[PDB]
């Protein structure tokens, strides 16, 4: 069989990213603690221009919005977009979302191809898929495998995860590019690999379209991703403390820590309490409730029920805006 | 063990 | 096209293995010869609990028998089996066979899915196949390639070999899992890779079903694999010694060594003789005859013809039980 | 689906290569500058017999011509060819072409299978393809992926490049073997990988048939590849020097250097001139014109127009034979 | 060379 | 930059 028609449909909508960045940190034998004390003067941190360079990006719409990974563009001073046809432009960064490793770009160009979107929820483990990006800077290349698994969360790459896992060969330089189904429709943004060698060993991960679209639409509208904030640190419940409360494995979440000055604080959430229901929804898994607070919009008064002094107490908080992560990519 | 979620 | 229906048929019958083992050997800078002489006392070997952990296993029958690799469970103190549905049990080891790198497990559970068995002898190089296991502990993942070759013996992994070779991505954590054909039927137990990097480079090996079933059925019946024992060490024949005997390249096998006290010894097999026929079958390849003795059952009187003092002599031995390999996995 | 019929059609025409070579250079801790001055005498360079060994080769015709990579056989003292059926012969080297990394072999044997040739120009990115060779010396193995891209030049592997890029697993030992399409017809000679680990990461390159045939036919006829020689070193033109001439981005090629005694020299080509047209063809890309001179036959008078002293001048050269590359593989 | 099988 | 082709 052949997938050249899928390649023809989607490939023109996948672009190459070249990013440059000025940096104050060099090769690590030099410029360390030893430099300034290895019989040598302080002198000056010489800031080199390093090239994140190889990446990829998907042309989401004809108006010139590009999707990609945050870790490719974070910190860039310049982003060059190179189209399959050979056109080049410098892009501007509409906005980023480090917690899902996604970025939105804009270019001013017309006669721009756009990716047909598939439906992430409709993929099944076993479906053939194709990966399109710029491995090792060799040029746009297409690789082929199958959906290995779906909804991989708990990888620990980013704080909000719903990864597709693909067999197809994904290498450094594929980040940002398209994961596409046999028809040629976008089902993911290729993001991460698990390797022992720095190159593809057949364990690759893409962000599914459903999550990507939702992030991109919020960035275009508000320049940001809007997420609910409660301000609480929470840890799981075990049988061992299931008993101590006297009422056991109701899916409890333990309020280990409450952000000082937060909306949960401001609503009288207290350290050492126990959360039974968030917004009339039972709070069992820390992930579960953390994602439910993320989707709850800021400005929404919600009810929270907590087992505190051994008796249910009913509180109310006003969900706030979630603050950015700041330093890391 | 002890792992912490934050929202 | 898509292989999601095959994945749906077989995936539920592939499980994840987590094994723990207590060990007396630690990281090798410490506890070596230097420890006890590096200005330090003998103290005590501290035995750490190490996790062979990631492996996989195939649910051979509804009654709860699991197949897997010996090297995953050898030496384990505890084996946890985790089912695709999320159920968990501790398994017991029915019995192992280091010489084919296979182990049989038993769990007590019902409503258990079972793998439909394909026919190993019917696969042809070129057929698509799927690999199911737990690479890197990421979760059950399905990977896809083609049968690259068949009947790979002489790899030197184990003493009895008949390996299928597959393109599909096999990594640490896939050992024990299913190799499956496009329909979704078991054709192998994934066992070994050849890599320069510790991860899949597309050279993977699975034990074919035909051999696996035969090993598993013998383990369930007798707790052991029953193999013929002759007690002889044998080396090949070359033209150079073809002449010295005066009768050349009759496929001879040279009796380099005879186990002392063995059934070949007890039948008057002698070092430096020459074996022309084992059990009225001509003995050409050392592998050939070693596999023929393995399949001959213990307790079977057989005839052996040897060129000793330059004239054929007819001996008779009673095939014995083959003794285990003991130390290595 | 299955590709076993393609494998059956082409696999018998792919052979294994084992080459041995005597070498004067050993392991590099020893025999270096330190050896002869590390309190030790000069003694003698001991020349070891090293085995390029694993490679592959395609049986181009029933008369016994084999195609393969130059880097597998270059320098060999003996080349053993091992056929899929198990036959073995020693081959002779008809001739090599280091600049495309191709070699032609001859064996004297009959009842020889031959590879059906596909059409390199007809492949499209997305087509399934199969790779046949001897990875790691494990035996003939077939691997499967898709055409990832086409006409990869500028990789820098060899001076004349037109590489197919394939997903399918290519490892050390695959060089020389067949890249084949879903029908089973030769579309390339597998040649190179880009890896971070020395093994397949899904970035592999094959020489396309069209180029391979053309090289092989010239070798069989003349023992050599016949290429046009101009004897010039040429560097690109930028806007910055586009202006200085006064006439800009006409695709110019700058004659940085003229071989002394060459046909361009002999025709009055001069350093610092500017080439506008080679053989009534405009000379824009250095690659473009270098390939056009390569295809122009030696002995052909051609016209060259150069912007020298700010005014077009018309010269004539007689294309010569291109001299070999000599040392490197 | 010399390689040894054992049964 | 400066890259050189030779024919």
Author numbering:
A (entry chain D), C (entry chain D), D (entry chain D): 53 to 381
B (entry chain C), E (entry chain C), F (entry chain C): 4 to 10
What's the paper's own text on this?
AlgW, a membrane-bound periplasmic serine protease belonging to the HtrA protein family, is a key regulator of the regulated intramembrane proteolysis (RIP) pathway and is responsible for transmitting the envelope stress signals in Pseudomonas aeruginosa. The AlgW PDZ domain senses and binds the C-terminal of mis-localized outer membrane proteins (OMPs) or periplasmic protein MucE, leading to catalytic activation of the protease domain. HtrA protease is characterized by its trypsin-like catalytic domain and regulatory PDZ domain; the catalytic triad was surrounded by several loops (L1, L2, L3, LD, LA) but, usually, in an inactive mode, and could be activated by sensing a specific molecular stimulus. The catalytic triad (H123, D153, and S227) sites are located between two β-barrels and are surrounded by activation loops L1 to L3, LD, and LA (named according to DegS nomenclature).
In order to elucidate the structural basis of the AlgW reaction mechanism, we prepared the periplasmic soluble domain of AlgW and its inactive mutant AlgWS227A. Protein samples were mixed with two types of peptide activator (tripeptide WVF, decapeptide SVRDELRWVF) prior to crystallization trials, yielding four complex structures, AlgW-tripeptide, AlgWS227A-tripeptide, AlgW-decapeptide, and AlgWS227A-decapeptide, with resolutions from 1.8 to 2.6 Å. AlgWS227A-decapeptide could even generate a DegQ-like “cage” architecture after symmetry operation; the dodecamer of soluble AlgW contains four trimers, with the 12 LA loops protruding toward the interior of the cage. LA-mediated higher oligomerization is an important regulation mechanism in the HtrA family; however, very few close contacts are observed between trimers in AlgW-decapeptide and AlgWS227A-decapeptide structures, indicating that crystal packing may, in fact, dominate the above-described intertrimer associations. Fortunately, LA loops could be reliably modeled in AlgW-decapeptide and AlgWS227A-decapeptide structures, allowing us to explore the conformational regulation mode of the LA loop. By comparing the two sets of decapeptide-bound structures, we found that the LA loop shows joint angle shifts of about 7.65 degrees. It seems that the LA loop in the AlgWS227A-decapeptide structure represents the major state of LA, because similar to the LA loops in tripeptide-bound structures, they all need to stabilize the antiparallel β1-β4 sheet by forming main-chain hydrogen between D129-Q130 and T72 and maintain the orientation of β1 through the weak interaction between T71 and V124. Consistently, AlgW-peptide bound structures also demonstrated different interdomain orientations, in which the joint angles of the PDZ relative to the protease domain are AlgW-WVF (25.62°) < AlgWS227A-WVF (25.74°) < AlgW-decapeptide (25.47 to 26.48°; average, 26.13°) < AlgWS227A-decapeptide (26.65°).
